[PDB]
Amino acid sequence: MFLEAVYHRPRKNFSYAYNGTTVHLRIRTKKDDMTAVYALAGDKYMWDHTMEYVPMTKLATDELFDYWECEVTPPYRRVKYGFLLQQGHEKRWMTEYDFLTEPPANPDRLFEYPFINPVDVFQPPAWVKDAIFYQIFPERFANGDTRNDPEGTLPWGSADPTPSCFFGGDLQGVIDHLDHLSKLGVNAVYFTPLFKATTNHKYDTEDYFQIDPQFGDKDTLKKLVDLCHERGIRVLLDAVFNHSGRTFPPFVDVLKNGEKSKYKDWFHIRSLPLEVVDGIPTYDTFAFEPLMPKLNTEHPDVKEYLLKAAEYWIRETGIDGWRLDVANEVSHQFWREFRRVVKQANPDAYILGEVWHESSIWLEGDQFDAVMNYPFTNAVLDFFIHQIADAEKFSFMLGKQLAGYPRQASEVMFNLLDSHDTARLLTQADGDKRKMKLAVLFQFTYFGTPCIYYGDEVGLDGGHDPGCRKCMEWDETKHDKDLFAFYQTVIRLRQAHAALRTGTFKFLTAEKNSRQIAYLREDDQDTILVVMNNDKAGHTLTLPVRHAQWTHLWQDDVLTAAHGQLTVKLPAYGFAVLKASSD
């Protein structure tokens, strides 16, 4: 029974509490080398009186693995258990140590989940699910205030636009075209850095306690927030808590004071002088940009600064959370203390961090709420855009990570597809609105929180940091309405139902060398089913469904598809952005 394949580790995604009484148990094995697997758990005290095999079910299957669900509510908020791992009539149960052949006599050597402590519990702001993001770079979005700088005016490029120079994007602008996003139909907004910096990208933080003069001030921000919290839209601010722009005071001190500097440890010293030239930054910097030293996040005073900082805005601006510019490099400790803080200021505060890699570490309810689900992103794009991965692969990538994280966090994943740090979805494809649409959809079709990089609903071809961050197009003329409409529809659609929000998620087609996808989601009222066609063109499908429901109404066109045979016939024009529910 391909024994050397199974795995089960306490915590992370392989054992965690969803609530303060129920618990989930995950277990992995070879693709289909596992007839069944029951969860044998109970209380570590009166064992022979609390044991109940919990039929673990297959929830996901990546390339070479089978994962298993299992809903357990320990009679006494505590559980010791093993696993069954069954095949044919062959049985072998897993213990904390080896693989027994006869039912474990003493619960002593069995896995164990100490006690359900409603505190340690992971409780990310559930309002994210209902919510639907929309990212925005303050620098080049809107400028409702003529007082900014001397450099470059609004838009100019088309294919090769936006240089790493300047533009006058302000907050007021956002306050202006706010009713515009209101038109777009947003739920929340993520703001890139907007703290007294000295560059277009405000990641060169001079003061963690002030809004760049050009941008505005607290009020402007607040006045901006207030209408948001009025239009029912949360708000997020960038937390450059790792590196500080060369400007940042404590740094200057060290520079213009070398050794004797009283802020010697506020960062990381390597060489007496603060020289670099061509050699190497004599101090731990971001990547290798001297104008960005890494803060000694472990340093006491440094802590408070950033701490009171984080809470500050939350406290006074009343923002809706912090995005962590780059967290996968800042003390996990500060991260700990961080939450507690941003919680005692606003429990519902959303702690999003920038982690492009597997981050089950920070998602232990001990540090973050969510992260940049690049892994997810790395799938869609790797499927719809680059179209190098097939269907199964997609479902496969939506397994290694589908299970990789716990039930909750997963449901609150900041699943985007593009940002200021990378290229734009559109160009990723290439004016293939069709190809794009099918992706953007999956985004607003999967669970967790989706994010819309400003300018796209309208249609914008970006590139990398300079390109991607292309100026906004405020001339109604340039307005891919059929694209904006696409969005709105997709948006409200993401709202119109809950299954798409956080419903189930099966699949009825992925067969290897294929490009046609179909999956299912549902609650106890409405059951919808989405289908997409990547084919360079048309392609018809065939697949079975259930009866409990009543019919199959074409969503968008509000048309109606019939079950027909014991299988529903579904046609795809070429890039079937076609999906529907089932009365």
SS3 state of residue 143: coil
Q: Do 455 and 418 touch, CB atoms closer than 8 A?
A: no
User: Taking CB under 8 A as the criterion, which residues in 88-107 touch a second copy?
Assistant: 96-98
Does 109 participate in binding a second copy (rule CB under 8 A)?
Answer: yes
Give first-to-last CA distance, the chain, whole Å.
Answer: 43
Residue 545 identity (one-letter amino acid): V
Q: Do 388 and 428 touch, CB atoms closer than 8 A?
A: no
Residue 63 identity (one-letter amino acid): E
CB of 53 vs a second copy, minimal distance in Å: 21
CB nearer to a second copy: give 400 or 494.
400
18/563 Cα distance (integer angstroms)? 36
User: Taking CB under 8 A as the criterion, which residues in 313-352 touch a second copy?
Assistant: 328-333, 336
CB of 446 vs a second copy, minimal distance in Å: 18
Is 284 one of the annotated binding-site residues?
A: no
Does 544 participate in binding a second copy (rule CB under 8 A)?
Answer: no
Q: Do 195 and 210 touch, CB atoms closer than 8 A?
A: yes
Nearest to 463 by CA among 151, 163, 80: 163
CB nearer to a second copy: give 22 or 117.
117
User: Taking CB under 8 A as the criterion, which residues in 204-233 touch a second copy?
Assistant: none
Does 356 participate in binding a second copy (rule CB under 8 A)?
Answer: yes
Structure tokens at 223: 């006045």
Dihedrals φ, ψ of 283, to 5°? -145, 140
Is 168 one of the annotated binding-site residues?
A: yes
> Which of 230, 259, 298, 316 is the binder for a second copy (CB under 8 A)?
298
> How many positions of this chain bind a second copy (CB under 8 A)?
54
SS3 state of residue 231: coil
CB nearer to a second copy: give 30 or 433.
30
> Which of 89, 146, 288, 565 is the binder for a second copy (CB under 8 A)?
288
Is 170 one of the annotated binding-site residues?
A: yes
Residue of 354, 411, 456, 522 with catalytic role: 354
CB of 509 vs a second copy, minimal distance in Å: 22
> Which of 83, 111, 133, 383 is the binder for a second copy (CB under 8 A)?
111
CB nearer to a second copy: give 96 or 480.
96
CB nearer to a second copy: give 270 or 506.
270
Residue of 204, 325, 369, 456 with catalytic role: 325
Does 287 participate in binding a second copy (rule CB under 8 A)?
Answer: yes
CB of 63 vs a second copy, minimal distance in Å: 7
Does 524 participate in binding a second copy (rule CB under 8 A)?
Answer: no
Residue-wise DSSP of 513-579:
S--EEEEEEE-SS-EEEEEEE-SSS-EEEEEE--SSS--EEBSTT--EE---SSEEEEEE-SS---E
Residues 6+ apart with CB under 8 A from 286: 242, 243, 292, 294, 326
Q: Do 536 and 554 touch, CB atoms closer than 8 A?
A: no
Does 76 participate in binding a second copy (rule CB under 8 A)?
Answer: yes
Is position 354 annotated as part of the catalytic site? yes
Nearest to 16 by CA among 170, 121, 172, 137: 121
CB nearer to a second copy: give 65 or 263.
65
Does 11 participate in binding a second copy (rule CB under 8 A)?
Answer: yes
418/426 Cα distance (integer angstroms)? 9
CB of 59 vs a second copy, minimal distance in Å: 18
Does 118 participate in binding a second copy (rule CB under 8 A)?
Answer: yes
> Which of 90, 119, 165, 565 is the binder for a second copy (CB under 8 A)?
119
Does 562 participate in binding a second copy (rule CB under 8 A)?
Answer: no
SS3 state of residue 434: helix
521/447 Cα distance (integer angstroms)? 10
Is 378 one of the annotated binding-site residues?
A: no
User: Taking CB under 8 A as the criterion, which residues in 49-68 touch a second copy?
Assistant: 63-65
Residue-wise DSSP of 305-374:
HHHHHHHHHHHHH--SEEEETT-TTS-HHHHHHHHHHHHHH-TT-EEEE---S--TTTTTTTS-SEEB-H
> Which of 52, 108, 179, 230 is the binder for a second copy (CB under 8 A)?
108
Is 420 one of the annotated binding-site residues?
A: yes
Taking phi over 0 as left and psi of -120 to 50 as alpha, with beta for the rest, 162 belongs to left
Tell me the binding residues for substrate.
Answer: 243, 323, 420-421, 465, 469
Q: Which residues are catalytic?
A: 325, 354
User: Which residue ranges make up the annotated binding site?
Assistant: 143, 168, 170, 243, 323, 420-421, 465, 469
Task: List, as residue ranges, the binding site for Ca(2+).
Answer: 143, 168, 170
Chain residues that interact with a second copy, rule: CB under 8 A:
2-5, 7, 9-12, 30, 45-46, 63-65, 76-78, 96-98, 108-109, 111-112, 114-115, 117-120, 284, 287-288, 294, 297-298, 328-333, 336, 356-358, 360-361, 366, 375, 378, 397, 400
